[model samples]
Target: GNNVPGEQAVLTIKLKGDGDPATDTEDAVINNYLVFLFREGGALDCAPYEGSSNAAATITTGTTAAKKAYVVANTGALAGGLFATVKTETDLLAVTGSLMDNTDNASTQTKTNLWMSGESEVKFNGGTNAQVTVSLSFVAAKIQLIVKDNRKNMTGGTITITDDAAVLLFAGKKGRFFGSAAEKVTQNEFYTGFNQYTGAFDSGVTTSTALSDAVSPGDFTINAGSTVFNHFYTFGNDGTTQPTILAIKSTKTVGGTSSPIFYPILFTNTDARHTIEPGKSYTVTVTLNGDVAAGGGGGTTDPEEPVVSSSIEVTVTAAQWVTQPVD
Candidate 1:
């Protein structure tokens, strides 16, 4: 029974994103990537590749591609098949992989582009001619910070953003997978644990004069007016847990003095925390004002009022799919 000749099958997996197989440059083309096959019962079937154990199989456009057609010569040869049978037309075929490059640790920490094809009912009727097509989806989320200087003409200062915990910089956040919407997946411990990630932005231009002359009615300008600092961060699906308490700090410099004036702009607004979802981008716009009096402490000569405004933007990418018949 284990060596039955007609029990083998073939599967043609077509990768897609936002609709077409060639549209997505991020996860569509599988170049030297590993593909993991799983049966309906949630068991690992095989990790098929090209040359050796290290060599990977690439799936791309064109029917003649080396990885276009995967031949399941013997079901019994599959790692999962060792214990059970792959029921044709009844079992489910789930696949995930096409390994991402983890070279840049910092960039990977931001987001891990993982390819996953949700479970699909296969019709491979245990034969050399039987085939099925599985379409994959790219799942990952991104966060962008758009910092603007609304204070007008004030110069020379630094901007710092710190969260209650290291929710943004945690390295393990990359491994978290974005399960199907109905799956109700939870984040790992690394993302749940308590940590700190503090980022500073001193890129704002420094003014040559002191804040005494720059402060108007209730506004203080940083840099030469209307300076913008834009930054982007990527992360895996975070579920319900989003970033919290993003404190903002701005310090101004005087023309001749070595010490700079400090301004603390609090971002306590609860609406700012946004859930990280797959295929979506969360944009946070933060505006800083200098003419305001110091809220409480942090040493201010005139200590005007602290003025700040923030808003969020969400952008979702179009979903894609590929359907092909197995000959």
Candidate 2:
């Protein structure tokens, strides 16, 4: 280790994957990750690295002042290439991942996992090989709907996702990496339009899911608690002022006459924790619903904007971090 008077302010880096699939994608695969360091009130500090910078990788350029570093992982060029064009930290917030782009349903996999990102403060003031760690986060959030039939009046019912893309339902509310939940961007072609899943719906789910159509139907039952359905995903919007809306469509046979039922879900909660944040898992439960065959003209099921009697219990938990805050 010869001396050049000082260490040129170089830095050593480490990357850790956020494990717990409970708050992450089921098939979390990282083919390659990209790294960027942003200058204090300016554009990026340098050209950028293709990110071979393993846990102890080296960077021979930096300053003593704190710099913001952005790391994006599991990207398959569609998004990785866009990161290459990111000139500023502001530019970093807009890169999006197409759900239909990275999927190849040859086996038991979901889409190409999730294109994820995160931020960390980096400095190079130790005068030697200073080490720093960057914790990456899934830009996408996990969502599931659990129908709680505590009264056990639920013999058999249907969970028909009426959205355009049943595969990733709850994803109706989504946006890019860093914007506020209010300024959240609408879902583009990548998220909407595709009933994307390279394989089976999920490991533990035993029902026909949206493998080919945007509208999916499945028979459901509940025990002491409830039955879970639609292990879908959505990008973060972390907001409450405007409840994210999801319309659930179904058909009911009352007195043996099947009639269409539409449940427009306005993603809201009694306590107002209605948000979809990154790396967070949300399980929404409807305590009761009109009995499948209990319809003799006076059931508890309401018609318009009536999501399970217009009552939704949304509880959000995170592996990395709560029904965090609702509307």
- Poorest 10 consecutive residues of model 1 by lDDT? 204-213
TM per model?
0.46, 0.61
Candidate 2 is scored at a TM of 0.61
Q: What is the C-alpha lDDT of each candidate?
A: 0.30, 0.46
Summarize candidate 1's per-residue lDDT along 28-93 as a digit string, tens digits.
333222233444333333434222121122322112111222222111223443113433212322
**lDDT of candidate 2 over 89-128, digit per residue (tens):** 7788766543333342211224454555666786655544
Off by more than 4 A, model 1: 1-6, 19-29, 40-47, 50-105, 109-119, 125-127, 156-174, 178-185, 188-233, 236-270, 292-327
In model 1, state the lDDT of residue 166: 14
Query: Candidate 2, 321: how far from true, in Å?
Result: 6.1
Q: How accurate is candidate 1 locally (lDDT)?
A: 0.30
